[PDB]
Ligand binder design. Sequence first.
Ligand code: SF4
Ligand code: SF4
Lengths: 539, 534
Amino acid sequence: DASAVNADFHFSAIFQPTDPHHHQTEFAKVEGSEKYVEEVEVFGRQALKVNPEALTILAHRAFSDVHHFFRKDHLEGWRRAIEDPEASDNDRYVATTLLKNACIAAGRVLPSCQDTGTAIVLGKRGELCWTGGEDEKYLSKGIWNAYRYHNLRYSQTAALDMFKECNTGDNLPAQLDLLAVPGSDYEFLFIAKGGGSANKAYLYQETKALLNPKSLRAFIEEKLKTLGTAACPPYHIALVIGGTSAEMTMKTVKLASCRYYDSLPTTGDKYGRAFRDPEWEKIVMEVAQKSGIGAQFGGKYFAHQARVIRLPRHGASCPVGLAVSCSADRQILAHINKSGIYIEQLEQNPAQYLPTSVKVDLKRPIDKVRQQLSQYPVGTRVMLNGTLIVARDIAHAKIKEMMDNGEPLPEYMKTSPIYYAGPAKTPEGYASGSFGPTTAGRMDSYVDLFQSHGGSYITLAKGNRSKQVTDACKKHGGFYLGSIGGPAAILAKDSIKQVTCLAFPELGMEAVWKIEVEDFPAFIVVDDKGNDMYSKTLA
Amino acid sequence: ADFHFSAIFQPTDPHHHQTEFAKVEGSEKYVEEVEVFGRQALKVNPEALTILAHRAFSDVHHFFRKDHLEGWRRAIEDPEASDNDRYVATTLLKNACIAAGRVLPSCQDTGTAIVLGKRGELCWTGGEDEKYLSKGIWNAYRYHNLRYSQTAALDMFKECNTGDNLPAQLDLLAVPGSDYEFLFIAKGGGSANKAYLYQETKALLNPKSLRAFIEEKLKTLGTAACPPYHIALVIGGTSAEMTMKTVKLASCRYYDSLPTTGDKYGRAFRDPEWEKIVMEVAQKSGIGAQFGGKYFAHQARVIRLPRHGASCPVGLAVSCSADRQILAHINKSGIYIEQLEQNPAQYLPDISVKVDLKRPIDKVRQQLSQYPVGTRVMLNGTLIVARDIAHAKIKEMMDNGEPLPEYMKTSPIYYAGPAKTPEGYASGSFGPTTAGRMDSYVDLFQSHGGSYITLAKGNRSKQVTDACKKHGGFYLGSIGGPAAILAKDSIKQVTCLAFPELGMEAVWKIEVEDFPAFIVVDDKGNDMYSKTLA
Ligand code: SF4
Ligand code: SF4
């Protein structure tokens, strides 16, 4: 029957930010850009004409500025990570390491991170914003300019078929999300999203049984360990409870990690509105600090901050989104209006935020090095000096085809440790472009096979690894060293001296490189006995 | 300046000329075409958005696509389909025939209202698109015999039903031109829940792991979202939401006309070869269209995407048997809406045990214990009805030391939630609700003396199977999806007893006749799904 029914109709938008036009953000205008606009009035309504050339130009300051600078809230976290008495020493060192990288990047020659990311555009074209309609082509051109004329990295791999792939050669196409919105302006958020943090976007399908403090707290405790250290913490953690579909939930959790939703309300209503959840944002941070995971190597600063947005849901549904912003916190707001192009101003003076080292010579027989490494327990910090072999997914895959017919393991797979990494482009007159590690766990499947054929005894990367790497190292007497994640520019400037392609030339950044390093920082993570320095915080 | 743009998605029919559209009578009166600065523009009375959205989210609950219908006839015409496959597919065709009377919707789950809108550069709406589309949905759902399925969160844990099926998911994209194109999807919660994302690696990208992965992953869909499934698989993507958005649209066939070859500039393509490999496992899995057989799935879509070198996202999502999406567009001639097939009967190829439920459960348990799992049966008599809120509430009642609800001890428990009742009808659409979402309560409740006889849809955990074997219980599987034909033909009387504030989740009392179900788990350790997970 009808007795709990209702009455009149009231539209309430799901997203109701209190700062819809991002007035809380400081913007700078692109000089002379009033030449791109003309005030008109049509059918009694005011409209705005935009030269589509502006999109290439606009997308190119944003996708240039953003690879060298961070937002103040990211930077405040780094100053804070150093000054907190409760931060571990390793937090401070990593934050110091991360802070030193950011200072190098502001020189505009070396990019702040090695993984210069996927180019993502969120666009909102006003009803009366007239661009000529070629928005997508010109925006893609601006990213291309940033990536063609600067020392960034091409990270996107096109699939010619299921297994045959080729590089696009310019890190294009971009993700262009152009939304239709009210008004006559054009608003943008540009995001250069690292693959590592894009990969740390997880979807779980849960139920109402989850929606209680005890279960949800336990869920967050349980699931946070699965984020690990593989996306260069401190993290901005975003958690989205509810959503009208998985993809909408994941888009929402993506933007929260990007602080796009910071000005939402903090209470729900009977009409179903998004809200920020301060209590559960606080709860996420409490879990992060007590987790002991720390800034890559143990401590309190697993996370800068957290955003938790509660959304409405279908009775049959409970989508949940979890996503991070990484150390390379890279986003930029902008808008176009009758006065021209305005672009979020980032902090040009990072300096106000500015406040165990055992040398291991790798230029020795690897058997002497294995013996020395075998002398120390996991968690031991080290500084590496000598030759590294650089190889990641495609180089591993190329190496795997030889290995797949059961013999021989190529000799070049047996002489040196395998460094999972991919460098950014080398600036003119510089020895190396940005060059930090990439997540070890993704190459985990190659170690046991290679070790069983007498190679890949030592691997070097970032991120927690699977039991197979621990098991492999214990059986064969191997070691895994973790470089600091994020400081790609200062490693290249001070530590990385030469890069040459060794194998698989047809590949791009994913070829095998041979490099010689000095003062390369790492921790002994896995020893030759079954030990793993993450076994307590990451099980 | 050696730059060449290649869109990721390059459909060969981006405006869906292959789809048939009808003009809304008189809708040319709501628009007037103008030309500004040498370009063509369109003034649109936003009532067109309401009208389209209010007809779209009415029509789509009563009719299906031909490619959907063709699948059921194929399931009927295949000599290798099981008998149980053919009955369900026939029932769905019969349900569609029941639904075509335009009063009862084919499913009780009127879905999440999803609108994909694509506003051309020179398409001018007045800017209140969101308000006017939402107004149209409210009209469709307020004035029709649908269901209000959206639950507003007052805080993180306190929830209430919104009472009108709003808000919708409105993904309005900016594209070239001056027209307005739409795909409307009424997405059931059960299948929305059965959209899974896995983070895999290059190590997957070999025949054995991917084939095995597909074998492994297909089973995790189970039968809990009312198969036959349209299965869409997307390998790669630039972000989770893009992988999941793409697999959603592929499963709704929005991307069916993509190219079949890739290129060096990074474009999506369909891979027909791997669709065939997915289907053989689906058929040989034995999971079937809910109750065993070959027609676990109607068809598959597999799209290979570009990827970040460090990444290999994989998205899996389905459109269920209640396949409810409608393409539409607004142009210079008025409002055009995809014309669906209004005579589904043409897809029908024209060329048991009487159980008295009005007894003590001990007589039924003794009799039922005599039969093996997998038997099709037709039930006649009393069912006790309880779902999500009652399930959450029943655990809460027992936690305050009050054991087992009065209504849980007198009758077999039928897990279900009704749609609104049409004037003069005994019942609105009244199909089952997924048992699996309540599994964590199931072991507790049976161990505490309740839920001895269950009737629902979906695979259940081994603990539920073990319980019926341990306690001499039975789980009966209703067919999932045919909510309308059960109400018209099987359910004769329904009365509300307590807790009306729960809406669709209130307690109801119903009398049924010729109610079909399967013996899924018996009281002897047998489970008709035991072969689904090998
Ligand atoms: S900081 Fe770490 S997670 Fe972020 S883009 Fe760089 S390597 Fe990837
Ligand atoms: S077929 Fe099943 S899962 Fe799909 S909408 Fe209908 S009731 Fe929901």
